[PDB]
Design a protein around this ligand. Structure first.
Ligand SMILES: Nc1ncnc2c1ncn2[C@@H]1O[C@H](COP(=O)(O)OP(=O)(O)OP(O)(O)=S)[C@@H](O)[C@H]1O
Lengths: 139, 54, 97, 51, 70, 378, 54, 144, 40
């Protein structure tokens, strides 16, 4: 009885899913999501969802009429395409830049170097920065 | 012309010994030291000592 | 600032912050050095008595650039050479505007 | 075009974002090819130095 | 309504800029020609820490740029 | 004021357990006891030392001076609640209550620590209190009250990456690991030897060097051993200072199979009369013996006592009984022959050591869960 | 005899030269930590000039 | 239990209140997170103890003992001015002492983000006092 | 409760196994080395 009841629950998705984003949760089996229709809703949830898959901020599948939490989405929703993916490189080499040694070296140690030698910072106690800012006259 | 050839001669020797020892051994396991003494082109005293160190 | 703000019945206390002295920079250095990976046998008073009366902000910069100088050597501890070169770096930046 | 401001009127914001759209997509990462751009005005004194 | 959206964009940017994990390796590089029209709420320790300027070159850098490009 | 406090428990160990060694210890125990105004921690040792013929006035004047120093602070508290600083009462008499607790027993500890702990919001004072707990729990060898705030301190450590508390607790957990039979942890905690501040528990940095070599000559075999203590330099200079430290290092790395028990005789006779090795020196010796016998027996398979008598030492029957017990102890598998004068080795010893530790831990874990699962339901 | 003459004035690029040659000669005359310290003084000396181009 | 500024669940047909919702906004705290000053304490200001004593006597002493002032019968103080070269501890001392005396630190300098969190941005600057009456042990701090 | 009817009446243990190996023979084994270095 129980397994067929479990799968009779599963008629909910099937092809009209709309994408909200997870915002908050009251408690067990009750959450708060805000749709991409601008507004914000107090919804109920399905007992299907593994609760590890939520509660930072996840694109989540909502029902149309009932407007309730149904499903979790994999990470998605373009970063203007995504991450250039194969070949959209500017084709500029190292020696093409001429005489910028302090600045190239500093940008290297600020960006490229913590990308790899992550555990040296944890041992020396440096606290490598989060964001870096460049500026200067145009040209 | 090097300032220290103790490093280079002695330590590169201390490497190049087993760089030869991987040559002379890689064919076969049950190897006799008295015929490998000719292939290594060395007396067998430091062969026994240095290979025990290896 | 305004003279109308400087009516003596207006502000209750006026509190001076001098630039730090040798002992003051020594205390600042012994606070900001407490997060790094230092080494025994280091003389901090030499480092404080090479500063030209620096600010309370710049000694933290000395500690961070000392960490950077230890980092570029692929080393894990920080010795006094990195501190002295950081002193040189900050006193070179002191002539920037 | 404009030049630049200390953000006087709120309408000038959108012009500056439009001009930065131009400045980005004339240089960018995906460089252009063959798109020759003819530009004409009366007084280039009022133009943005970034342009 | 034109500035309220940019305003909440800055708010969301700051709020997801702050608490990654202090362990999620995501480096953020930003660059503008103008370093004057910046609300200093960005330029705080933790958010945008290092400041790098690209000034006009000088004699040795002119020589190096000449030797490279030419 | 618990910085010179370690030599006290040092002499507590050093006096009573060797029988004939009972004069210089009680001499400078008096020389440390009738100053600092020490009253409480020595009633057991007072019943271990002599009668101390006049206990009447010579100590009661001291505890009366203690009462004056105590309730001058306990009547300074009303003068410090007049101007509430950072609870200047509790901030003043926290370290002076640890002065009183250097006088007193651990009751002043267990109430003054948890008293002043919830005072501060600056965690450096909390860290100092945790140091105080670790030290006094080491003094009474209370190896269970300290393991709580080891973890509760490492929670207060690891909000990021620091200098102070990381290296300090490296030293502290290193001494706790060398207290118990834990040797690879002791080597890993004593890995640093670079920023280990000349301390009160590091009463000599040289003694710290002797400890970190006396456990690193056990812990690992050779895949960092030459690189740390031989190819290193910062350890090499201070082991170049003492002869006896460098002696056993270059002996065992040189494999001088007769000077080993000379070096070990000196180090072991010091190991007898040294604290925090008292249930430890016995297994230490056979550990060094099997660790030398491993690197001996590894090279050769055609070897015997006829090779032992000239390169190792004498007493062929001693070699016989020692290797007999150590081989029949399930250790260093190699088979020995009688008068045909043959000691043959088993060339891999990696068949049942594979199967070994899993059954040897499953035994204890199943024996745990037997009783502890039958604890519930009556 | 000469560093007292040099640091009394302003000039810095000559301190580079004398400390550099002293880092050579103490390595030559086999004093390794003193060569380290004399090199370190040059290391912190060389980070104070806009143009040490060679 | 209907507090001002608290999220409630609203049914959709009749528009009836369904349930009170947790996780209130905390706009003062959100503004504080927007500002993001360095949170400091006593032990990282080492070398300026006399100024510490001054700010003790002028801020910690009104809060912990108002009736000392009211017994001696003068005006309890209300203003502190800090000067010196820029970069000598002008911020950490104020933030730290305000943290130890348990006061809600507030740094309103010049943004319009702040002008949205405090009020609606309409007319003036005094609404910070409206948000300061609700968290009454609080201190206001500023730059140049 | 549990009156247990009466008509009738690491740190310690692994190295006590090892000490049972050490107990009857060679307790403070340091001198027998120096005793037997000159015997044979
Ligand atoms: N007492 C101190 N000891 C050591 N470093 C300090 C001390 N006070 C501040 N610092 C550091 O110096 C930096 C600048 O000091 P602040 O307290 O921020 O003064 P300030 O903000 O520079 O004053 P301004 O620039 O005129 S608003 C801080 O971010 C700290 O890293």
């Amino acid at each position: 009885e129980f397994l067929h009841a479990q799968e009779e629950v599963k008629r909910i998705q099937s092809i009209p899913l709309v994408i909200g984003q997870f915002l908050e949760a009251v408690d067990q089996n009750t959450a708060i999501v805000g749709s991409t229709t601008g507004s914000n809703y107090y919804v109920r949830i399905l007992s299907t969802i593994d609760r590890e898959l939520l509660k930072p901020n996840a694109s989540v599948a909502l029902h149309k009429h009932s407007n309730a939490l149904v499903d979790v989405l994999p990470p998605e929703a373009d970063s203007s395409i995504m991450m250039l993916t194969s070949d959209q490189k500017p084709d500029v080499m190292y020696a093409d830049i001429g005489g910028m040694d302090i600045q190239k070296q500093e940008v290297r140690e600020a960006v490229e170097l913590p990308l790899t030698h992550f555990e040296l910072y944890k041992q020396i106690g440096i606290d490598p920065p989060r964001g870096v800012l460049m500026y200067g006259p145009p040209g | 012309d090097d300032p220290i050839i103790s490093t280079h001669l002695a330590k590169l020797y201390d490497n190049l010994l087993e760089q030869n020892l991987i040559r002379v051994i890689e064919p076969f396991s049950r190897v006799q030291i008295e015929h490998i003494s000719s292939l290594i082109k060395l007396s067998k005293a430091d062969v026994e000592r240095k290979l025990s160190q290896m | 600032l305004d003279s109308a703000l400087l009516r003596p019945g207006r502000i209750d206390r006026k509190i001076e912050f001098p630039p730090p002295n040798e002992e003051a920079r020594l205390d600042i250095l012994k606070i900001h050095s407490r997060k790094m990976n230092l080494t025994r046998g280091i003389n901090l008073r030499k480092i404080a008595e090479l500063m030209p009366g620096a600010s309370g902000a710049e000694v933290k910069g000395v500690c961070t650039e000392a960490g950077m100088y230890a980092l570029r050597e692929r080393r894990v501890h920080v010795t006094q050479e990195d501190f002295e070169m950081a002193v040189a770096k900050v006193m070179q930046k002191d002539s920037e505007k | 075009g404009g030049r630049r401001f200390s953000e006087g009127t709120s309408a000038d914001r959108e012009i500056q974002r439009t001009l930065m759209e131009l400045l980005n997509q004339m240089d960018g990462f995906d460089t252009l090819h063959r798109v020759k751009m003819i530009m004409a005005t009366n007084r280039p004194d009022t133009l943005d130095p970034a342009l | 309504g034109a500035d309220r959206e940019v305003q909440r964009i800055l708010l969301e940017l700051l709020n997801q800029m702050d608490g990654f994990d202090q362990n999620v390796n995501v480096k953020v590089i930003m660059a503008t020609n103008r370093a004057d029209t910046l609300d200093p709420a960005l330029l705080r320790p933790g958010r945008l820490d290092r400041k790098i300027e690209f000034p006009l070159p000088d004699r040795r850098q002119k020589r190096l740029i000449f030797s490279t490009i030419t | 004021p618990k910085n010179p406090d370690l030599r006290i428990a040092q002499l507590r160990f050093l006096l009573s357990l060797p029988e004939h060694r009972g004069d210089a210890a009680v001499r400078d125990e008096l020389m440390a006891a009738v100053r600092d105004n020490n009253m409480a921690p020595y009633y057991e040792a007072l019943c271990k030392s002599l009668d101390w013929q006049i206990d009447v006035d010579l100590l009661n004047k001291m505890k009366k001076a203690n009462e004056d120093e105590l309730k001058r602070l306990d009547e300074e508290l009303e003068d410090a609640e007049k101007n509430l600083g950072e609870s200047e009462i509790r901030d003043a008499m926290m370290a002076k209550a640890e002065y009183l607790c250097r006088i007193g027993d651990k009751e002043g500890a267990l109430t003054a620590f948890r008293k002043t702990y919830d005072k501060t919001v600056a965690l450096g004072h909390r860290l100092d209190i945790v140091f105080y707990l670790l030290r006094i729990g080491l003094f009474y060898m209370d190896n269970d009250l300290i393991t709580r705030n080891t973890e509760k301190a490492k929670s207060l450590i690891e909000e990021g990456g620091d200098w102070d508390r990381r290296n300090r607790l490296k030293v502290y957990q290193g001494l706790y690991c060398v207290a118990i039979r834990d040797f690879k942890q002791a080597a890993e905690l004593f890995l640093d030897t670079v920023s280990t501040f000349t301390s009160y528990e590091l009463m000599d940095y040289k003694t710290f060097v002797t400890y970190t070599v006396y456990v690193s000559m056990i812990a690992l075999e050779r895949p960092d051993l030459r690189e740390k203590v031989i190819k290193g330099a910062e350890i090499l200079e201070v082991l170049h200072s003492l002869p006896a430290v460098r002696q056993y290092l270059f002996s065992l790395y040189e494999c001088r199979y007769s000077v080993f028990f000379q070096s070990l005789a000196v180090v072991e006779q010091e190991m007898k009369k040294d604290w925090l090795f008292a249930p430890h020196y016995r297994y230490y010796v056979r550990e060094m013996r099997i660790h030398a016998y491993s690197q001996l027996l590894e090279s050769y398979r055609s070897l015997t006592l006829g090779y032992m008598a000239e390169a190792f030492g004498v007493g062929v029957e001693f070699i016989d009984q020692e290797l007999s017990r150590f081989i029949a102890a399930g250790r260093l598998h190699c088979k020995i022959d009688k008068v045909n004068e043959i000691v043959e080795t088993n060339r891999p010893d990696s068949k049942n050591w594979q199967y070994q530790e899993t059954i040897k831990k499953g035994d204890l874990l199943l024996n745990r869960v037997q009783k502890l699962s039958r604890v519930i339901n009556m | 005899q000469l560093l007292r003459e040099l640091k009394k004035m302003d000039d810095k690029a000559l301190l580079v030269e004398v400390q550099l040659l002293e880092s050579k000669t103490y390595h030559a005359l086999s004093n390794l930590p003193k060569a380290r310290a004399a090199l370190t003084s040059a290391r912190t000396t060389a980070n104070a000039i806009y143009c040490p181009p060679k | 239990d209907v507090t001002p500024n608290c999220r409630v669940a609203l049914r959709n047909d009749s528009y009836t209140l369904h349930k009170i919702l947790p996780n209130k906004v905390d706009p003062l705290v959100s503004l504080m997170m927007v500002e993001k000053v360095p949170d400091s304490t006593y032990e990282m200001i080492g070398g300026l103890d006399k100024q510490i004593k001054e700010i003790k006597e002028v801020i910690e002493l009104p809060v912990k003992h108002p009736e000392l002032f009211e017994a001696l019968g003068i005006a309890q103080p209300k203003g502190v001015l800090l000067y010196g070269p820029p970069g000598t501890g002008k911020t950490l001392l104020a933030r730290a002492v305000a943290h130890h005396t348990d006061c809600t630190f507030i740094r309103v300098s010049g943004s319009e983000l702040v002008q949205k969190f405090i009020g609606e941005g309409a007319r003036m600057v005094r609404e910070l006092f409206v948000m300061a009456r609700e968290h009454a042990p609080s201190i206001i701090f500023m730059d140049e | 409760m549990s009156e247990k009817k009466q008509p009738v009446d690491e740190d310690n243990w692994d190295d006590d196994n090892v000490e049972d190996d050490f107990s009857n023979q060679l307790r403070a084994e340091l001198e027998k080395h120096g005793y037997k270095m000159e015997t044979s």
